[PDB]
Amino acid sequence: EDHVIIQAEFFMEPDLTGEFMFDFDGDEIFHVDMQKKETVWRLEEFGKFASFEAQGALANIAVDKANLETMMKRSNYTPNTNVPPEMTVFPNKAVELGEPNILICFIDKFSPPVLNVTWLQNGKPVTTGVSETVFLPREDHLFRKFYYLPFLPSNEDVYDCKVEHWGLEEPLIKHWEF
Amino acid sequence: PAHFLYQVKFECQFSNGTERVRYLHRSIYNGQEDVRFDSDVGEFRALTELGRPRAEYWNSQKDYLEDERASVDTYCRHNYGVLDGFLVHRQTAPTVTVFPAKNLLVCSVNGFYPGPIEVRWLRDEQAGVVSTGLIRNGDWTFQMLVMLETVPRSGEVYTCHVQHPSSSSPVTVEWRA
């Protein structure tokens, strides 16, 4: 079929985190921030073409929570099975030395939706203009998330994306250079 | 160590505009679909035992059932209306550039949306051509690394050709040997 519009919510205990997002043909439209209780368009431009009062999603999320407590009691506190992710580090544009680019770390086919992702420059942790998508939904109910390191091609310069998912024995780490 | 997870996912599938609209409500506990309302069925179905009571109870809720039955209109058709206005027909043309690897040349289509594309090489062929496939960059752009092995034959031209529905006119980029 031609197009898809997924409204994906989740709640998880005891980390007590929510996500409420809208997807289209695989890319996020917007999501609601639980802390700032505000709509957050994936691209700023979408704010111009539509709106969504965030209080509806926090209503829903708070109904998701109660339903979690119920299913746990009903399921005899059987935990979620941790499925660990696969990973890809790759440049956003083609690489040309001295010209700004973005390094994408894409984390795929994992559950549950918790990640400790750490971007690394020549072995030194690095955070400058770092961004990440929300946890994106999949048809098998596992997840994917996108991490972005704004960076400058360099030849003599290696970047590592490390993830401390507790579906892993040891950190998963993928390198990239010129 | 003991995490417990619950996913609600409301799905609208559209074909041929909005003359084919499928609604899917799914309740997913620890990654297993338990109960699902599907518009093409018209009622909740318990996928696992854990559902029965809810599906039983929800189909008994005559008022909510009509809400769900009607969602292909009030929810799907509506939300698609709003999308048609910017998202649905979003095009963004690629940024096609060629170079050697690590002979083996690499046609690098970048920044293109939506995904569907036709990348090809020529010697002014099929064999020697290796693609990554379509790659979500998560910013509503795709890329694709279509590479091609080649003996560096003297004064021969390799053209990488890219017809995408962004601009009717095909982008093409050359590399002389």
Binding site: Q7, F22, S51, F52, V63 | H25, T74, Y75
Partner: peptide
Amino acid sequence: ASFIIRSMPQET
């Protein structure tokens, strides 16, 4: 131009 949401109800 407004997106509209479906809501779940609860379980006793």
